[PDB]
Amino acid sequence: RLVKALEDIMVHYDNTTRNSLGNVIQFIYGEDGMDAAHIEKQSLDTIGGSDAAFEKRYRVDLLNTDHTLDPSLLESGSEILGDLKLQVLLDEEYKQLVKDRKFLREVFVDGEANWPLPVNIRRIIQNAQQTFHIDHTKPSDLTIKDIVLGVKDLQENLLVLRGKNEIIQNAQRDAVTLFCCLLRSRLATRRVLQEYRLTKQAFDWVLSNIEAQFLRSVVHPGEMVGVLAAQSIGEPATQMTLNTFHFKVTSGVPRLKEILNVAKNMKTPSLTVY
Amino acid sequence: LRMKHGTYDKLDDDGLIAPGVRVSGEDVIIGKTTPISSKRDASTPLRSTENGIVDQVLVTTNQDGLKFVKVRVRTTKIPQIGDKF
Amino acid sequence: VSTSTFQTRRRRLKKVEEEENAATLQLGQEFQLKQINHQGEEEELIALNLSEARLVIKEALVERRRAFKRSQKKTREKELESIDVLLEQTTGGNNKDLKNTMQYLTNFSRFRDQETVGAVIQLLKSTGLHPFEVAQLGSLACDTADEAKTLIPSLNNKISDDELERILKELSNLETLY
Amino acid sequence: GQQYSSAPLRTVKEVQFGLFSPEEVRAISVAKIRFPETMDETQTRAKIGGLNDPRLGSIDRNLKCQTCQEGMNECPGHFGHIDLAKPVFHVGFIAKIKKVCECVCMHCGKLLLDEHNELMRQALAIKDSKKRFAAIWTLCKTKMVCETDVPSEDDPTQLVSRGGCGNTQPTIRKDGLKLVGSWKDEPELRVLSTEEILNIFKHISVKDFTSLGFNEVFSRPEWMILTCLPVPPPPVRPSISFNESQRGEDDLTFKLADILKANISLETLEHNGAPHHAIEEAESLLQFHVATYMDNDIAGQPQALQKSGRPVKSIRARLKGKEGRIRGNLMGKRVDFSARTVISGDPNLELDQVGVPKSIAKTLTYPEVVTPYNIDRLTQLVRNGPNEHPGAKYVIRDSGDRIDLRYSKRAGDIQLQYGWKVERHIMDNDPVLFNRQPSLHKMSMMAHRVKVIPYSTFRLNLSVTSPYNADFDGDEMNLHVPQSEETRAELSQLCAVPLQIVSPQSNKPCMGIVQDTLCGIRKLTLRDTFIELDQVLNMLYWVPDWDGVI
Amino acid sequence: LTCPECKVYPPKIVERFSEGDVVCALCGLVLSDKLVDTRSEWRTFSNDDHNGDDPSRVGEASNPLLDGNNLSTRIGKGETTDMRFTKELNKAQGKNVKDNEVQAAFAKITMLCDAAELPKIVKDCAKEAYKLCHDEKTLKGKSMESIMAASILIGCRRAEVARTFKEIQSLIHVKTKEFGKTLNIMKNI
Amino acid sequence: MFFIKDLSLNITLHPSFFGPRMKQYLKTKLLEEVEGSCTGKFGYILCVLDYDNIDIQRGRILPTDGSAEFNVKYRAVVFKPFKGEVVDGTVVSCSQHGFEVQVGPMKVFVTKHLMPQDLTFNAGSNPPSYQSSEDVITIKSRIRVKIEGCISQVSSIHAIGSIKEDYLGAI
Amino acid sequence: AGRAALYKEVYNVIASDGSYVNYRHMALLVDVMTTQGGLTSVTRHGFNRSNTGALMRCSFEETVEILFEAGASAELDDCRGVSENVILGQMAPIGTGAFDVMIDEESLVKYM
Amino acid sequence: LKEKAIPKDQRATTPYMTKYERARILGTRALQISMNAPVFVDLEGETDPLRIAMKELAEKKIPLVIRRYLPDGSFEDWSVEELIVDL
Amino acid sequence: LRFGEMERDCMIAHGAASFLKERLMEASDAFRVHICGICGLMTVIAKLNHNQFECKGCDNKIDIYQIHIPYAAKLLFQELMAMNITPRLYTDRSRDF
DNA sequence: GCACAAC
RNA sequence: AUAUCA
DNA sequence: GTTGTGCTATGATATTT
């Protein structure tokens, strides 16, 4: 029944999800436009922790002796101190970071950090160190501008939806909202220089790989998405054993019938009052 | 008409194989024709997936006296790979 | 593999709809005058009188001999002969249909030169009759406006009796004396 | 093969459903069908100018198919007609027919509710033909009078006269396969006869039945009532001639003969002195046979049974269930170039390989096409013959002529021509679809790489057990061989095992290390575990990807 | 069939049923590809399905030698059935019902064999002996209950079922010399 | 009459022709299949114009065999007779039943009964002719005919004509 | 809000077994049940009562009663469903069938 | 109507080749090659028509063109020369 | 062996469209009928030898397409016709989309 | 034997 | 049709 | 309120009239 109901749902060449009638079901497959097989659980960082430790991790204050970047972290660090033009970039960067925070907390209200997102950024930073033999004791040749403006320019390249009009472009910005939140939390100026100790060469490679991997992760038009969905649900419903085990709401297979039949007379009706 | 591609040589003129002859796939154990007019072939071949040696062959008539013949085929099945235990 | 046209039609299942064709200018569904270009623009029907048809085909069969020699890189009575040369060079040779058409066109054409044909084309196009009628007027030589309106009943009242006689006068003059 | 036709090959783009106009049924038909006799020109061996091939389809390995010729493996079979004595209901629309009658004025033919009515104006606005009929019916099933006089859309003071006729409408109810009316001290009750209905429907206006969902060209109400009967050709109802005293006819051929017999009977009754009640008695017999032929599982009615006590396989019932024509011959069907056997595990195979018994590989075939690349290699295969493993079974010429290599005397001599095909044995590294039922998700069918091995089992790597859900307790699996160069590309590029490793079902790999290897990979990994030189060299060598550096 | 390439008068051809092909044994040319299983195809007409669940079971076998070609189903009770419509449609078959009635003399042979303890192969020979001699001018006007009493010994004398003429004199009836002359004018036919 | 028509044919190419002389083979296959054919729908397709600008377009590749199907758009001169059309032509045959007049690629038959009163078939003439006092119609003369009707036999179009009315006949 | 609670209730049935299905698959099912305007059941009188192709609807559960109605309503099947092309034995418009491949003479003369 | 051909600029689909597009191109070309279609690449001893088609595809010398149908009837033509292969 | 519904769902979920087609046609049923292009019926009297066609009833000898469909599909349409239903097959579209 | 659909 | 197989 | 109407796991294999 599940298959025969999702049969003709697929993704079309405008990254939309329609049936044999052209009726729109989803506007961008999976709401993100990503092919499920290319997704991995990743820690969203930003979302949790104390405000105090968040500040310790992301804030850079080139205008303050203590909270600036130590000249051990980069070459330009000694002549970076007090640079008013630059500090507006980092102020922007950190303002955008705290925006993401209050947003992620509006999206995952329980504060869960680990969600499935494409492109494993943690393993790209790893592969960048293993590759360029990053020296965790020598200053990098990155400029604040190199890092900050680089990550802003990458973001504009992670396109799922092309389309010159405004509506499509908006649906584009929206489908990359959560990924870019992850992205800014991992290539934040401080974190790049202090925790990853990347070099200009490594950093540029990392941004290159991110873009190329992101592209590889978007759904291919033609993907039968619906049959795929029915099987993805039908199959583990077979492995379902209740078959309780060692031993008051109806769960498992018989409850799954109710849901699909939209049975008006359900066995275990209840409501959780807070 | 419509003879079986299998071989009929193992048949004695009574249309039966004598017991003791070794058989094999598609070979003709019992020769039969259904005259209609000269006559079509209604013979019984050994199952194509099997083989062995004919164990015993008996000729009889039934409750109303129709000649009918039973043929036993013996094989020895030696444990092989896909076999279940 | 049945060669198709330039226009579309709704298959109402009732094949019983086709009408006949006459000299009430009811040509086919195919040959009605508002028809469509390969580029998709709506142009008018093209019916040729002979002379005009004889030139189109001749001009086209020569454009074709050219192209065949390119790819090779890597008096009326006299014309009847030259034409049969051009055919054995450019056509499939089995084309008895075209071979007769050229013998016919070559023997029945009133105007020989492209200039003369153009003169007929100019003259007959101020009258704004059907393209079928101007073709007939270019093919059938007539002396009286009655002869015309008898052999081309499609006219009757489209053009005046005396204005049509003016035209037959100018056609008779343009007529090539082989 | 199947011979060439100059007709343009096209694909089906639209399917236009409708009902058969009796005019059309008559027009298509290539035979009259007059007699309930099968063949037997009285104890003979030829078809009777009456039922199956009166002029019709052809069977029995004989061309004769009315000029058309061709015979069996080309002839689609063409239809005959049967002219019914009186109209009868098509069982499928007894429903609809009753509903239409409730919507239309009987004896008049007008719709019971106008655009003048306010709720009907709304129903008539509906876009879906099906939903519109629903609304319209629910409105004027209760309208029990054909109005002549109706208040205008200005004010109820002056009435505007709509369509005439001012009769009472019967409350129509279904009694068996008959429709019974009732007009309102004690009402008038009688049976609406088919001829009435058929006539009332014809009078229904084109704009009216169009509003009722019908369509002026393809599906008119009057065609819900059967007047002419399309007779299906033998292909749809095959016969078999066993041994001159045994002959098998299809249940439809039986059911048809009853329709005919019942028809011939009622025709004689009407022609003769019509005894009214002895005719309607014979009509509702005809009604039954025709009805029971399209559907034998009818609620309320007795089933038509076939001597042995079994009920006649109606047409409905052939399409219906799983194992029907839809679920079981179209949406799924058995296929050639397939194989099945017991699986067993093999730790010495690659993940993407599959162990194929030599016996199976010698039976299954791939029709490789001769080009000057494989021309030498194929000539050797043909020359091997179908007995030795690396060889071939058939050679197919350009004409479509196929030659059984096991019967040609100059087998190795056949000078292959480019464009000819050679059906060769499945060889090592040919791509195959491997499948274990029930195929619950897409990893239950994966493209593998043939390794021809001995013994009678399919051999697969253990880590591939997890998605097929196979244990080796006597499980069997299915192999399918692609036949096109194009179709194997679809397997190798899309369905291939190594591709299916990371699954979209749950964004994680669905295949892992299992059983022995999982258990032993722990015992190898302990800090206690040390290995000495002699056995280390053996482990190293055992890795095929070893860089040769101790 | 005969191979178009070879053409030798005894056309040596094999039916490779297993590959579903008809081959010429000499040149190897395949002469046909569509090939059908007659056993399983015959299983669709004469099966073991009396219940009605088999989707393969779709026809029924008949006997064109004995009852000619009379295809006819019977109105009977089904799962969802009112006992009213069965009666009406059966009372309607009564109005639709001479030599098409002399087939009830098969019911005379069948009820005689079952009273004489005779096999199913004997009845079908007695019914074929009776169908091919009951309208003969060579029998003309013989005792009509002694010509079917003679066609039972004709059916027994081929099916190898030992039945003396005095054994059939006990059944019906038989007038000895009357069904003895009739047992000879038919024997010539 | 004698029209120029915008037509399109579907040719299918087997992959082995997917070489450099592809467009050439196609235009050739067009001139083979279309030129000198005859259909009820368009008449006699006599000659294809502008051999250089024949549009080959792109070829959809069929999904079973590798072959590729094109929709070749071309312009042609056609000939389709109509009832009521008046045509000049030549007599090609002449029997006791009438005579045929070859007009363009098509013949038109003039039955002896759509002929002037006194114009009657005389068989003593060599060759047999129609011999009025002021007319002689035989196997080579030029005639003006009025087409009384056409018969479509999808391979050729044949027609029947009259010379009875005013302004017709010999010329 | 019903769409959400419907995903939530389905999610619970999968997570109660300790299993995990990627959000999109469940969201797709749920999104399908609700784009009609209300809760469309995955049953013979739900999803199979929509206005899709007639052969498609007939391949699940109601077969003949769907084809009779298809006849009297003079339905037209546009053959975009996978079911139709399978019944018809044509290359389905799915995956490898979601586009078309054509030869270009211009560039073929370029490469050779 | 054939006005539903979206022009070269104004194309808006992925400039990357889809996994099925590539599968069909390889299959299609391999097929034609095995049907003796001319080969547009120096086969360096290669004999398997799929292996050859892959060599054609990695040299961008397949003269095919994907016609991408949109759900409303329109289409965008892309040539394998221009599509990006990153699979 | 039976390539069933569930085995079909898998070949779809994979996107292997041609494989599905080959498995359902070449690997099995695979029949060719001629249809009239006026009524979408299969009532054409195709005498392939004489290259004559014609669908009388439409009196059409010019508008005929040949198509490739499963025999079981041809069986299905003939059975629907048997029941008065007209499964009309057309080779051109008329609907947009 | 359900469970939901129409009388 | 029963029995059975995973 | 009652009736009435669709369906109810995938494939496989072996006999019995």
Ligand SMILES: [Mg+2]
């Ligand atoms: Mg198991």
Ligand SMILES: [Mg+2]
């Ligand atoms: Mg297991």
Ligand SMILES: [Zn+2]
């Ligand atoms: Zn035929």
Ligand SMILES: [Zn+2]
């Ligand atoms: Zn009325």
Ligand SMILES: [Zn+2]
């Ligand atoms: Zn031979």
Ligand SMILES: [Zn+2]
């Ligand atoms: Zn037709």
